Amino acid sequence: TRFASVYAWNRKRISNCVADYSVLYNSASFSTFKCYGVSPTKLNDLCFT
Amino acid sequence: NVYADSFVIRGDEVRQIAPGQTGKIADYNYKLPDDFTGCVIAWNSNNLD
Ligand SMILES: CCCCC/C=C\C/C=C\CCCCCCCC(=O)O
Numbered sequence: 797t798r799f800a801s802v803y804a805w806n807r808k809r810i811s812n813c814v815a816d817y818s819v820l821y822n823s824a825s826f827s828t829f830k831c832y833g834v835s836p837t838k839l840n841d842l843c844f845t
Numbered sequence: 846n847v848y849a850d851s852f853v854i855r856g857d858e859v860r861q862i863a864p865g866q867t868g869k870i871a872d873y874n875y876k877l878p879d880d881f882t883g884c885v886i887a888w889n890s891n892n893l894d
Contacts, residue, residue, distance in 0.1 A: 821869045827857045829868075836867040 815844070853894060859887050 800806040817839075834842070854862075854870060861868045862885055864877045 825855070825857050827860075829860075835865065837865060839867070 815839070853890070856889070862887075 829836075831839075852875070858868070858870050860866070861870045862875070862877065864879050864881050
C-alpha cells in the first residue's frame with residue numbers, strides 16, 4: 797500500500813518459496829526491467845541463494 | 846529477402862521486442878531469433894488507435 801523513502805529504503809528477505817513471475821503478467825506492467833549477472837531467459841531453470 | 850511485420854502493442858512493452866527478452870509478449874505473441882539481422886521501428890499512435 798505504501799513504499800519507503802529513498803534515503804530510508806527498505807529491505808526484506810525472501811526464502812522457502814518458488815519463483816514464478818508469470819502470475820504478474822495480468823496485474824503489473826514494468827517500464828524498466830534489467831538483470832546483470834544472468835540472462836532473462838534463464839531465470840526459469842535456476843535456484844537462488 | 847525483405848519482409849516487413851506490423852502490429853500494435855502498448856507503450857511499455859516496446860522494450861520486449863529484442864532478440865533475448867522475456868515477458869508476456871516475447872513468450873506467447875512474438876519472438877525474435879538470436880541471430881537476427883534487421884531493424885526495429887516504433888512510434889506513438891495515440892491519435893489514431
Ligand atoms: C519478491 C519475490 C522475488 C522473486 C524471487 C527472486 C528471484 C526470482 C528470479 C528473478 C526475478 C523475477 C523478476 C520478476 C519481474 C519480471 C516480470 C517479467 O517477466 O516481465
